[PDB]
């Protein structure tokens, strides 16, 4: 029959076959279930889509064409769930959130 | 000269799907590549531990769902679980 990618069957953009291969060759289990690569590819795609949409919103708010690392850092650090997920992660060319303690501000 | 096999094209497809007009730089592309690799490693390792604890030899979608619940905080886990369940249901119907 005609070849059909598993990503197309699951309706995803991320590669289900590549994820399956990485799971099999990654020393994680003796066997890998059929739906596990689909599930984890869907999860990865969802996380990527959420971060990219937030970064694109940040870039548009700065009236910029392209997402640069600063926009990714702004998207993650301004979301508490994303900050908790990436608490111990350093982003290259990311900078820091603009925050000044109220005590340092003059009267 | 060994076909580095990154995640760039899929992230770009997702970006063009969710923001049809904005682009992305090479540095941000590499950062998102690293992010996908890191989250893959975290979820896969935690699912491997889950299978080991219960004396199972195979990683199933149940293991991945539990790993997602244990690793993602708040509504992130809920929405990721919904996405994974919907994808697996669609794939089962072929």
């Amino acid at each position: 029959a005609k070849a059909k990618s598993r990503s197309s069957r699951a309706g995803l953009q991320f590669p289900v076959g590549r994820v399956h291969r990485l799971l099999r060759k990654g020393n994680y289990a003796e066997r890998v279930g059929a739906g596990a690569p689909v599930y984890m590819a869907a999860v990865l795609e969802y996380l990527t889509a959420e971060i990219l949409e937030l970064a694109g919103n940040a870039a548009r708010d700065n009236k910029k064409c392209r997402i640069i690392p600063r926009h990714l850092q702004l998207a993650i650090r301004n979301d508490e769930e994303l900050n908790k997920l990436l608490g111990k992660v350093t982003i290259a060319q990311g900078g820091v959130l603009p925050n000044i303690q109220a005590v340092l501000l003059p009267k | 000269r060994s076909r580095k096999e990154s995640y760039s094209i899929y992230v770009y497809k997702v970006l063009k799907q969710v923001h049809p007009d904005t682009g992305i730089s090479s540095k941000a592309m590499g950062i998102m590549n690293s992010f996908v690799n890191d989250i893959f490693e975290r979820i896969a390792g935690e699912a491997s531990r889950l299978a080991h604890y219960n004396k199972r030899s195979t990683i199933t979608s149940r293991e991945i769902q539990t790993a997602v619940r244990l690793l993602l905080p708040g509504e992130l886990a809920k929405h990721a679980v919904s996405e994974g369940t919907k994808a697996v249901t669609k794939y089962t119907s072929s």
Partner: single-chain antibody, 226 residues
Framework: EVQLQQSGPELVEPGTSVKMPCKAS????????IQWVKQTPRQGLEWIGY????????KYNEKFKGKATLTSDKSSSTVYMELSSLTSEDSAVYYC?????????????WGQGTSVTVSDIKMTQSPSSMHASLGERVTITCKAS??????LSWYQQKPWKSPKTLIY???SLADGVPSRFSGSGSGQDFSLTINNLESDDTATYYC?????????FGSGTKLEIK
């Protein structure tokens, strides 16, 4: 478990300012933005703005800037909205609703509503009102002005009550809603279907979009049972 408490009705003369609380409990306070919605009988529901207690970030409706200011009190898990220069055209019920920072999420839980009285994307809900018996099919359409990538939610509001969420992300069932309710559609046309009706299901149904910065409700739909 999740509760958003509000204050009682306010009797305020024109020209002054009033502040109402949205004391919240039952969840991690800093993880969810608190959105404020006003409801007038002649313009339905209008989105005022939101506050993110994690970083005190705000975003107001362009038609409400200056008139309303939102403050976050992290210690008491309370959010206040301050309305200044109360004009005669401010007599309305003000709702405070919880919405997660995730783009897919919506205003899931609502406060009881603080009745204050003083002494762009357009949503089109095509069927204004309908009558049906205890077992038929009913469909409500929420044709949109621009496109929204399934960032549409369906709410049910019983009279003199806070709106209740039914569908979020245009297809996903809310928490605890029976599978009789079903939403569908994407892009600019969205639909809500009720499987089998009961005497309870008589209410007003609104469609909220949050795909763009000013959130806009639908015109409303009064459903009558038998």
């Amino acid at each position: 478990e999740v509760q958003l408490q509000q204050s009682g009705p306010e009797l305020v003369e024109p020209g002054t300012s009033v502040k109402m609380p949205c004391k919240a409990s039952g969840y991690t306070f800093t993880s969810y933005t608190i959105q404020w919605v006003k409801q007038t009988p002649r313009q339905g529901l209008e989105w005022i703005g939101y506050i993110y207690p994690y970083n005190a970030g705000t975003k107001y409706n362009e038609k409400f800037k200056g008139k309303a200011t939102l403050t976050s009190d992290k210690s008491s898990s309370t959010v206040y909205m301050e309305l200044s220069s109360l004009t005669s055209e401010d007599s309305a019920v003000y709702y405070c609703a919880r919405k997660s920072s995730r783009l897919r999420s919506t205003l899931d839980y609502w406060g009881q509503g603080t009745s204050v009285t003083v002494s762009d994307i357009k949503m089109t809900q095509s069927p204004s009102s309908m009558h049906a018996s205890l077992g038929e099919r009913v469909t409500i359409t929420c044709k949109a002005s621009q496109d929204i990538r399934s960032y549409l939610s369906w709410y049910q509001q019983k009279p003199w009550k806070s709106p209740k969420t039914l569908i979020y992300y245009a297809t996903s069932l809310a928490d605890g809603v029976p599978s009789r309710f079903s939403g569908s559609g994407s892009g600019q046309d969205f639909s809500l279907t009720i499987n089998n009706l009961e005497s309870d299901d008589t209410a007003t149904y609104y469609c909220l979009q949050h795909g763009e910065s000013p959130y806009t409700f639908g015109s409303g739909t009064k459903l009558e049972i038998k």
